[PDB]
């Protein structure tokens, strides 16, 4: 078999800068196709025969190699460009390379908190939902703990994170903790606290179950 | 302009077969062959065949021994594939693509077929609204929902800007969780509607949800 190997799996660019990824092949080649993908949507074909350009691409995007070694290059990077590409050839298997997920760096943005209590539908079927949205910042890791009065919460919440925004290029995360509507009930204070790099001081957001 | 149809979503029962379509347009529907491409998440892209339509030629990706039934049928412009015995390495999105004009890459993309295999019955969402209080934040909580996927909008289409659609979340329950939201100003929330639109046709649900102020009855005004 020939086989596609991508490097890096996973890199990072600030605006203007020159980026260049590669997929290189375990024997020769003579050409590699590259197509971009953003999260949940059907792969755009990107560059063809190894430097050619798909009709819609910016001529920023350049593309080029032989034999052995083929690259992917941006002249300067720009937010809409951050998405996974994968370099794919015909006479090697598995046909596609691995990708390589190409991400925007940028300035640091602190997250907007928000707290959601349990909807009063949702009480009258059986269990409770607190929602905490931390929106749109940079980078990615921040950390959530879910304060139900005194206590800590461990091992009853779920967190959830979008891709990398084209506008902006932050994100958003979204925390579910899940306690029935007893355990919801036999309780007052519920807070959400928030950590991350662009926040000097930790944020909380609060609400207390029968109150306004 | 070209452009391929798929099949909605699906659920099967492990060792049984699924049989997805791709409908083709705007171009010599024998002139082209359709490919068709598999991917799960962490395993990216990997090619499953082709068919030439209604050349009689076909061709199996090794992987797959027989499994995958490339057919076509030239005068209703729609190819098929149907996979023969089904574990849950099948669970993923499934696409057709129609190589270029003159050049062997995938240059027309389909929009993706989710298949998900599993003995687990069917289940349409409960969705609960994410009421502002206080640049304030709404939203609508997609829960308890199976199989994959769900999708969300606001004002039927109409509002996307600062519009937040998070990935499911697969929860302790074997049922799956997810959540949309929307910024907007404040100074809105008086007189400006917000209703979020959930369809998920594994159950043929549809709902759409007002998300409302839940401007309780122990305060004063605004």
């Known amino acids: 078999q020939i086989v596609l190997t991508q490097s890096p799996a996973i890199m990072s660019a600030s605006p203007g800068e020159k980026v260049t990824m590669t997929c290189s092949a375990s024997s020769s080649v003579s050409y590699m196709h590259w197509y971009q993908q953003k999260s949940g949507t059907s792969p755009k074909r990107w560059i063809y025969?190894?430097?050619r350009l798909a009709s819609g691409v910016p001529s920023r995007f350049s593309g080029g190699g032989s034999g052995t070694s083929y690259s992917l290059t941006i002249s300067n990077m720009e937010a809409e460009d951050a998405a996974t590409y994968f370099c794919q050839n015909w006479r090697s298997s598995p046909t596609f390379g691995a990708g390589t997920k190409l991400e925007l760096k940028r300035t640091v943005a602190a997250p907007s908190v928000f707290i959601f209590p349990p909807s009063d539908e949702q009480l009258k079927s059986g269990t409770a939902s607190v929602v905490c949205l931390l929106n749109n910042f940079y980078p990615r890791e921040a950390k959530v703990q879910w304060k139900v009065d005194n206590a800590l919460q461990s091992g009853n919440s779920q967190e959830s994170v979008t891709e990398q925004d084209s506008k902006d290029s932050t994100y958003s995360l979204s925390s579910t903790l899940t306690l029935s509507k007893a355990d919801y009930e036999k309780h007052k204070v519920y807070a959400c606290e928030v950590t991350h790099q662009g926040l000097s001081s930790p944020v909380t957001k609060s609400f207390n179950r029968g109150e306004c | 302009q070209v452009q391929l149809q798929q099949s909605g979503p699906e659920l099967m029962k492990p060792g049984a077969s699924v049989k997805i379509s791709c409908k083709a347009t705007?171009?010599?529907?024998?002139?082209?062959?359709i490919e068709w491409i598999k991917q799960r998440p962490g395993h990216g892209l990997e090619w499953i065949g082709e068919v030439l339509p209604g050349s009689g030629k076909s061709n199996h990706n090794a992987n797959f021994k027989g499994r995958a039934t490339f057919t076509a049928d030239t005068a209703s412009n729609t190819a098929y594939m149907q996979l023969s015995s089904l574990t849950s390495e099948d669970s993923a999105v499934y696409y057709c693509?129609?190589?270029?004009?003159?050049?062997?890459?995938?240059?027309?993309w389909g929009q993706g077929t989710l298949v998900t295999v599993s003995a687990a019955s069917t289940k349409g969402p409960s969705v609960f609204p994410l009421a502002p209080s206080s640049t304030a934040a709404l939203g609508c909580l997609v829960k308890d929902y199976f199989p994959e996927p769900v999708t969300v909008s606001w004002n039927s289409g109409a509002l996307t800007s600062g519009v937040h659609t998070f990935p499911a979340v697969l929860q302790s329950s074997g049922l799956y969780s997810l959540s949309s939201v929307v910024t907007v100003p404040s100074s809105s929330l008086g007189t400006q509607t917000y209703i979020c639109n959930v369809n998920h046709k594994p159950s043929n649900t549809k709902v759409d949800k007002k998300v409302e102020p839940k401007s309780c009855h122990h305060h004063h005004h605004h």
């Open positions: 705007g171009y010599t529907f024998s002139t082209s062959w």
């Open positions: 025969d190894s430097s």
């Open positions: 693509a129609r190589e270029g004009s003159n050049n062997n890459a995938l240059a027309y």
